[PDB]
């Protein structure tokens, strides 16, 4: 049909608006972030230098994506020359590669060592951050060479005036590129989206599950033996009155229950049948006022208030220390950065795998199908561009340390 033409022409209004917003917000946000990391000495040494690298991949994504490619939506003929069309997707593919790979090395270095007092997990090597930044950019350049080598320009003579263009050549010289030509939509999706997100989520989960276990060791060392904490869990499951309420509680409340078990034993905790039933029914304020009425509070008021506060609040506010602040800070920064990425490259990566799997020219239901696919793909482009500019903002909102470091540059 001739319907989706109006969609493309109308969307030209959206892309020019987004790209210009993305450009201004992108250059300012990453520059601020970049100046912040190098002004601070602890972050210059700390693994947050990887975030300074990510700010470079984002900032470089901005200055290749917005200037060159937005120029090609306005100008119908490709006007930069032959070398440039090998260079631009090279630059853009390597740039995205930097952003994903900076995320991965960040979470791996965070799991290797949570903070300065931590012990590196395996194969400690001095000044790893410098070594890791070098490896990230090289691999990002490598993954983008297939774009650069195969990108030549083709001349077409259109229905109106003639116009030359540039895309990835279908006719290719090496069997290397002939393979890459067809399987690029997967390569772009199976790598840039899957491997970075699979690797980063895996270490983030390993790290957060380790943080929790150490916070339990931390809270028990505060109120008063790693095998003792696991034997308590093993013994809680064996006790019949504690297993059901235990399985219902979340890891935070399970810890306070574990804390209660370390004082009185299983037999002693099993007596709060009124309070245990209230915890199962999620009536937190009730049991908190009800646990205050216990003799347990009178024997040790200070410690009980914290355990009661932990049951009431569900967060370690009563157990806040140096570690628990740091563990929460790192985990929130890593989590927020991956979530920003995933939500911005899913719409685009999902556009591609949906177009390759089920698309055929024979049917006439295309113009309802095609209209749906081109629209969602154009948004995915604006999503991916938004990621390049929404990373520096994301750190301010969910990182107390970054929100203050920006405020230090403010004043
Ligand atoms: C990270 O790599 C990608 C993985 C999956 C999808 C896209 C990817 O990178 C891309 C991507 N890769 S691509 O399809 O192979 C490509 C590269 C280069 C060109 C030019 C303009 C001819 C030089 C066309 C198409 N193309 C575009 C995109 N932009 C404008 C319009 C048409 N296409 N946006 C992406 O995302 C970033 C958004 O600013």
From Swiss-Prot:
GO terms for molecular function: endothelin receptor activity; peptide hormone binding; type 1 angiotensin receptor binding. One of its GO terms (biological process) is cGMP-mediated signaling. A lipid is attached at residue 411 (S-palmitoyl cysteine). Expressed in placental stem villi vessels, but not in cultured placental villi smooth muscle cells. The chain crosses the membrane at residues 13-37, 49-74, 87-108, 130-154, 183-207, 334-359, 372-398. Coiled coil: none annotated. Residues 38-48, 109-129, 208-333 are cytoplasmic. This is Endothelin receptor type B. Disulfide bonds join 85-166. Its main location: membrane. Non-specific receptor for endothelin 1, 2, and 3. Mediates its action by association with G proteins that activate a phosphatidylinositol-calcium second messenger system. Belongs to the G-protein coupled receptor 1 family. Endothelin receptor subfamily. EDNRB sub-subfamily. The chain holds residues 90 to 402 of 442 of the full protein. It is linked to Waardenburg syndrome 4A: A disorder characterized by the association of Waardenburg features (depigmentation and deafness) with the absence of enteric ganglia in the distal part of the intestine (Hirschsprung disease). Hirschsprung disease 2: A disorder of neural crest development characterized by absence of enteric ganglia along a variable length of the intestine. It is the most common cause of congenital intestinal obstruction. Early symptoms range from complete acute neonatal obstruction, characterized by vomiting, abdominal distention and failure to pass stool, to chronic constipation in the older child. Keywords: Albinism, Cell membrane, Deafness, Disease variant, Disulfide bond, G-protein coupled receptor, Glycoprotein, Hirschsprung disease, Lipoprotein, Membrane, Palmitate, Phosphoprotein, Receptor, Signal, Transducer, Transmembrane, Transmembrane helix, Waardenburg syndrome. It is found in: Cell membrane. Residues 75-86, 155-182, 360-371 are extracellular. One of its GO terms (cellular component) is nuclear membrane. It is a multi-pass membrane protein.
């Amino acid at each position: 049909c001739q319907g989706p033409i109006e969609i493309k022409e109308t969307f030209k209004y959206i892309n020019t608006v987004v790209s210009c917003l993305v450009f201004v917000l992108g250059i300012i946000g990453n520059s601020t972030l970049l100046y912040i990391i190098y002004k601070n000495k602890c972050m210059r040494n700390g693994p947050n230098i990887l975030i300074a690298s990510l700010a470079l991949g984002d900032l470089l994504h901005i200055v290749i994506d917005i200037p060159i490619n937005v120029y090609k939506l306005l100008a119908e003929d490709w006007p930069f020359g032959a070398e440039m069309c090998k260079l631009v997707p090279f630059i853009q593919k390597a740039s995205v590669g930097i952003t994903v790979l900076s995320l991965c090395a960040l979470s791996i270095d965070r799991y290797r060592a949570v903070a300065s007092w931590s012990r590196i997990k395996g194969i400690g090597v001095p000044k790893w951050t410098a070594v890791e930044i070098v490896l990230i950019w090289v691999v990002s350049v490598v993954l983008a060479v297939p774009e650069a080598i195969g990108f030549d320009i083709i001349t077409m003579d259109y229905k109106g005036s003639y116009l030359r263009i540039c895309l990835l050549h279908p006719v290719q010289k090496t069997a290397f590129m002939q393979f890459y030509a067809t399987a690029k939509d997967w390569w772009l999706f199976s790598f840039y989206f899957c491997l970075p997100l699979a690797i980063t989520a895996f270490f983030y989960t390993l790290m957060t599950c380790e943080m929790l276990r150490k916070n339990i060791f931390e809270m028990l060392r505060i109120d008063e033996f790693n095998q003792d904490v696991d034997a308590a869990v093993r013994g809680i499951l064996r006790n019949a009155k504690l297993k059901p309420v235990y399985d219902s509680l979340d890891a935070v409340r399970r810890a306070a229950l574990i804390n209660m078990v370390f004082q009185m034993g299983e037999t002693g905790v099993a007596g709060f049948t009124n309070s245990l039933r209230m915890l199962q029914q999620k009536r937190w304020d009730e049991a908190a006022v009800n646990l205050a009425k216990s003799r347990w509070y009178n024997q040790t008021p200070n410690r009980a208030k914290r355990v009661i506060t932990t049951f009431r609040t569900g967060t370690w506010d009563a157990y806040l220390n140096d570690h628990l602040k740091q563990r929460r800070e790192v985990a929130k920064t890593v989590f927020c950065l991956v979530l920003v990425f995933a939500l911005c490259w899913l719409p685009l990566h999902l556009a591609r795998i949906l177009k390759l799997t089920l698309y055929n020219q024979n049917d006439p239901n295309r113009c309802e199908l095609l209209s749906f696919l081109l629209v969602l793909d154009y948004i995915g482009i604006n999503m991916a561009s938004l990621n390049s500019c929404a990373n520096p903002i994301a750190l301010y909102l969910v990182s107390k340390r970054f929100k203050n470091a920006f405020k230090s540059a403010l004043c």
